[PDB]
Design a protein around this nucleic acid. Structure first.
Ligand SMILES: [Zn+2]
Lengths: 143, 92
DNA sequence: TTAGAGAATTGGAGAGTGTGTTTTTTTTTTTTTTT
DNA sequence: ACACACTCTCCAATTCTCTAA
């Protein structure tokens, strides 16, 4: 494909859990102790108090580059927390013209999304005797 | 084997993309004026030849394009046949 | 005078190898037990 | 194992030289 489809998705998408009055686990709140390792991958609901909130900063999704000699553009998609930027124009036409041109990054055609990180903690009146309260890290993107 | 090297060659020049384009367009491209300086008009002549050289064969520096052209221009008989054909057309 | 056949010199493609990385105050705001 | 620094090697691109038409 010419470019990754993520580059032109102008929208965000989210799921809203089942109404408990129609009801399933996503409708039934869990305290931060009940979130065992069994739940990894699932959609759940959590009840608690927020302890701290970060301020908004951008995160990359698709990065855009320009090749100087052959005047051609290439894209890279980022999922992990870190990445290596590109540094060689591997395009077949550029290669067959033996044109070992240099790649440079561009903001004006890259795609970002808003990011924020928070932390949630269990209610003090639900802590069992002699224990210290536990907490979870929450991530938030889009609108 | 390693990948063979890519070069300028008379086949590119004799292609329709090549030298016929210059003869098809040069009369319309360049324009001198007494109304502008020597340096002005002199600079103007090189524009078209530079852009054409890039479009033909982007490997190398402009000077290297000219000096490369000298070798094949003096040696290849088919290219020389084409050139005497031009000057015969004017003898026509 | 052109050109084509053979020899010598050089460039860098690219393949290979070894390597490094995780990890006693001194000054100032606040709670607590001690005279 | 994953980017780097450095070493080694082979192969063909190039220019130079000699010969004859
Ligand atoms: Zn390129």
């Amino acid at each position: 494909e010419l470019f990754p489809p993520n580059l032109t998705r102008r929208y965000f998408l989210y799921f809203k859990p089942l109404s408990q009055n129609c009801a399933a686990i996503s409708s039934k709140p869990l305290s931060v102790r009940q979130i065992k390792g069994d739940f990894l991958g699932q959609l759940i609901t959590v009840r608690g108090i927020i302890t701290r909130v970060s301020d908004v900063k951008p995160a990359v999704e698709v990065i855009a580059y320009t090749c100087d000699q052959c005047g051609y553009e290439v894209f890279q998609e980022v999922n992990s927390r870190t990445f290596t930027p590109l540094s060689e124009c591997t395009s077949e036409e550029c290669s067959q013209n033996q044109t070992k041109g240099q790649l440079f990054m561009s903001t004006r055609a890259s795609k970002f999304s808003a990011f924020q990180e928070c932390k949630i903690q269990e209610l003090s009146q639900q802590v069992p005797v002699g224990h210290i309260p536990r907490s979870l890290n929450i991530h938030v993107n889009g609108t | 084997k390693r990948r063979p090297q890519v070069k300028l060659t008379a086949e590119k020049l004799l292609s329709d993309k090549g030298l016929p384009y210059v003869l098809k367009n040069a009369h319309k491209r360049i324009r001198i004026s007494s109304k502008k300086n020597s340096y002005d008009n002199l600079s103007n002549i090189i524009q078209f030849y530079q852009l054409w050289a890039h479009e033909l064969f982007p490997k190398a520096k402009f000077k290297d394009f000219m000096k490369i052209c000298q070798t094949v221009g003096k040696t290849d008989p088919v290219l020389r046949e084409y050139r005497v054909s031009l000057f015969r057309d004017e003898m026509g």
